[PDB]
Design a protein around this nucleic acid. Structure first.
Length: 226
DNA sequence: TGGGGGCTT
DNA sequence: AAAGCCCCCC
C-alpha cells in the first residue's frame, strides 16, 4: 500500500477483521478468496473513518489507489475499491474503459464484475454509443468469461432504453457457452428485461436455443402468466 | 424448484 | 426504516 490512503485503509480493515465471519463469507464465493470477515455496513464505515481522516484523494490518484487495493489478498479490499470508484463516478469516462477491463479480468468473480458492469459500463455506453462496436464484439470473442458476462450485462438496468436487437444478438453469440456464469448472465438479463417487456422475452425463450438453465432462470417470474 | 442473511431503498 | 428482493446460493 505505497499510497498513504491505501496503507491507512489496510491497517484499519486489518485491525477490525472478524475470523468468525471470514469463513462463511469465503464459502459464499466458493473459496476463491481470503476474507477478513467484514460485511458491507462495517466495510463502508471503516472506509468512511479513513476518508474522514485523510479526505478523499485527488482524482489524479484514483486509479493508483484502486489498483493497489486490487492487488491486496483479502476480498474486502476489492469491495472497498469499488465503493471508492463509486465516489469518483463523476470523473470516470470513456478513457477509463481499458482500466475497467483490467478490473474485470483480474481477481475475477461475479461479485466484482457485476459491480463494475451494469453501472459504470452501462452509463459509459449510454453516453458514448459509438464505443459499443469497439468493445462488445471484442469481449464476446475474447473467450474471457467475465468480459463475455460484461457484454451480456452492460444493458442490465436499461429498462425501456434496452436495445432489443443488440441484446438478442449478444445472447445469440453466447447461447452455446458451457460456462455456468454465462448461462446465468443470459438468464438474469432476460429475467430483468422481462420486468419491462415480458412478451418479447417469453417469445425469445420459447423460440430460440439456450441452455435449459438459462431458460429456467429467464422465465422464473413470468411463467405463471402464460 | 423457488425462496432465503444480507443488502437496498 | 420497515419491508422487498436475491446478483448469488442450495
Amino acid at each position: 500500500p505505497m499510497h498513504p490512503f491505501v496503507k491507512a485503509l489496510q491497517e484499519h480493515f486489518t485491525a477490525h477483521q472478524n475470523p468468525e465471519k471470514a469463513e462463511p463469507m469465503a464459502r459464499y464465493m466458493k473459496n476463491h478468496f481470503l476474507f477478513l470477515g467484514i460485511q458491507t455496513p462495517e466495510r463502508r464505515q471503516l472506509l468512511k473513518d479513513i476518508i474522514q481522516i485523510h479526505t478523499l484523494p485527488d482524482q489524479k490518484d484514483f486509479q493508483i489507489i484502486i489498483r493497489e487495493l486490487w492487488d491486496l489478498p483479502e476480498r474486502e479490499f476489492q469491495a472497498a475499491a469499488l465503493d471508492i470508484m463509486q465516489k469518483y463516478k463523476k470523473h470516470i469516462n470513456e478513457t477509463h474503459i481499458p482500466f475497467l477491463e483490467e478490473l474485470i479480468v483480474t481477481k475475477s468473480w461475479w461479485d466484482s464484475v457485476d459491480s463494475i458492469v451494469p453501472t459504470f459500463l452501462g452509463d459509459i455506453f449510454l453516453k458514448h454509443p459509438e464505443l459499443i462496436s469497439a468493445y462488445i464484439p471484442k469481449w464476446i470473442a475474447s473467450d474471457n468469461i467475465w468480459l463475455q458476462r460484461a457484454a451480456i450485462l452492460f444493458q442490465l438496468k436499461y429498462k425501456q432504453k434496452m436495445d432489443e436487437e443488440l441484446l438478442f444478438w449478444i445472447i445469440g453469440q453466447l447461447h452455446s457457452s458451457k460456462e455456468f456464469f454465462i448461462q446465468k448472465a443470459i438468464g438474469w438479463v432476460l429475467r430483468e428485461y422481462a420486468k419491462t417487456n415480458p412478451d418479447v422475452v417469453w417469445e425469445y425463450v420459447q423460440n430460440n436455443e439456450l441452455a435449459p438453465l438459462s431458460k429456467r432462470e429467464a422465465i422464473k417470474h413470468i411463467k405463471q402468466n402464460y
